[PDB]
Amino acid sequence: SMEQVAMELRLTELTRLLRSVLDQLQDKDPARIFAQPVSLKEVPDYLDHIKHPMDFATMRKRLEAQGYKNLHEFEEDFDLIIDNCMKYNARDTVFYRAAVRLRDQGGVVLRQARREVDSIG
């Protein structure tokens, strides 16, 4: 139907906007601490601690399959990246600190993304 096409165009345009959001958030991680999944070869106990691992590459895979239906879903996955790290790693670590800085800097980007998603519909 034409309605199904229109909906698909909206999803494609959301995907476009989320791709730009993803790029901007990932620039706030110049160390690339969050770029890839935590390695279970290198942290074999990880899944005992963290039940829903997340990372920027995994988000990018979902994004390119048009797998985020709305900004809330995308924000859920970004918050997982941050929150997983702040639980597994202690406060005094470069990992925890990187997550705090990513959260703080990402807030700015996400605040305007929400306005754009509501604004453009």
Residue with tokens 């959001």: 21
Could you give phi then psi for residue 89, rounded to 5 degrees?
-105, 145
Q: Which of 27, 45, 47 is nearest to 35 (CA)?
A: 27
If one counts the domains in the chain, the total is 1
The enclosing domain of 99 has a CATH number of 1.20.920.10
Terminal CA-CA length for the chain: 21
The rounded distance, in Å, linking the Cα atoms of 98 and 94 is 6
CB-CB contact of 56 with 77 (8 Å):
no
Domain of residue 34: give its range.
Answer: 1-121
Neighbours of 84 (CB within 10 A): 21
Q: Which of 37, 76, 69 is nearest to 53 (CA)?
A: 37
CB-CB contact of 88 with 49 (8 Å):
yes
**To one decimal place, what's the resolution in Å?**
1.6
Chain centre distance of CA 72: 11
Residue with tokens 């306005």: 115
CB-CB contact of 55 with 36 (8 Å):
yes
Tokens of 90: 């202690």
Method of determination is X-ray
The rounded distance, in Å, linking the Cα atoms of 39 and 28 is 22
Neighbours of 54 (CB within 10 A): 22
The rounded distance, in Å, linking the Cα atoms of 71 and 88 is 26
- DSSP-assigned states of every residue in 80-117: HHHHHHHHHS-TTSHHHHHHHHHHHHHHHHHHHHHHHH
Residue with tokens 């620039």: 27
CB-CB contact of 109 with 21 (8 Å):
yes
Helices 2-27, 71-88: axis angle to 10 degrees equals 30
